[PDB]
Amino acid sequence: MEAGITGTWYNQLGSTFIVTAGADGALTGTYESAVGNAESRYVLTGRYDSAPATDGSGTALGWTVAWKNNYRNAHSATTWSGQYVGGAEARINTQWLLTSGTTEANAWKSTLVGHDTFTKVKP
Amino acid sequence: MEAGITGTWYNQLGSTFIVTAGADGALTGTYESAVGNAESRYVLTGRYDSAPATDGSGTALGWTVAWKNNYRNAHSATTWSGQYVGGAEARINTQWLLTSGTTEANAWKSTLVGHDTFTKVKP
């Protein structure tokens, strides 16, 4: 139902996040590269607060991408957790966790942490 | 001043954290391996709340180890952030961030996240 969220978003690197915000709170779409060829496209699914507070607070949301498609398998998954802030300069501020499948011994280097900011305007 | 904190601590892996809690709030010591030879020993420094609440809350603290000694340089630094919980089974519950120096292009894989639990008894 969140038209505010539904659409195309771009992060600082040029990656494109295309999402549809369902009235039920579902997020569905695809994540791809700057040179968005099919080989760089991956499916995403997530959830968002479909009834946010009206006091000016952002809209909490999160989504996951498993890095496997018909062209590649990076044996990993990334989750983005953050909030949508609407307005003239709408943005989705997030923090992410990228976990790679590792052997038990290598579990110490299994999870990278970072952050991304998405906007409606191409970088 | 925190005698509770001063001493030898061990995490799940066998790593040994030897620290002295200064009356001023300073933490000073060394971090080393299970087979604690000199080659595995690194200097640490940190800070802790020297006047914690008495309502049963833990004691907030944090420390840093730069992974360089006279035998090796892993070009990285780890910070542990957590709290000391005293008592019969005293423990230091932490979450850590390990950052490696990377080129600008590789900054995405610069930071690993994890957690450690330290106890007074050897694993």
């Binding site: 994540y31 890095w67 990334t78 | 995405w108």
Partner: peptide, 8 residues
Amino acid sequence: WSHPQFEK
């Protein structure tokens, strides 16, 4: 090693 998330 690189990763599809950042080749984007």
